[PDB]
């Protein structure tokens, strides 16, 4: 009864991380705004991956994993952070 | 929470793309949801947002879609999903 990432990259060109959903829906962040992802370069944020079933966002070099419905419900890291 | 700054229909790739007031973009295919089955291109850019801004409105064809429940993969109620045999 979810969305589910079917596909994920990081969109050089408009600074982006897309996510094309399984249900042909797409969902993309400014990876700025991710708690986690700051000042990561271009080249390391390129190297993300799915993950859970299909609603983590993982990057194993940096050891950072983002709940995609957690995204897309605007959460993009803890209080604290959001701050 | 999340919430439509702007919406509207791109026709070359056939969606919705709405601009989300936190900075992030969400676009689904308007012909999966409920009330737009049939809709013509012209039709669905007729798109507006009305709500604080969690719904997408289309004036002439009368629909009303949610975007939470778009962005949770709800497309209409599960009376119309079930009539889809």
Redesign the interface.
């Known amino acids: ?3 589910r990432a079917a596909k994920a990259r990081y969109d050089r060109s408009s600074a ?1 991380v897309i996510v094309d ?1 399984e ?8 990876p700025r ?1 991710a708690q986690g992802l700051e000042g990561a370069s271009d080249d390391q944020l390129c190297a993300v991956e799915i993950l859970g079933q299909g609603y983590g966002l993982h990057w194993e070099t940096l050891d950072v994993d983002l709940s995609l419905p957690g ?4 959460i993009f890291g803890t209080k604290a952070w959001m701050a």
């Open positions: 009864n979810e969305p982006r959903l249900n042909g829906c797409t969902f993309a962040f400014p705004l995204l897309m419900a605007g």
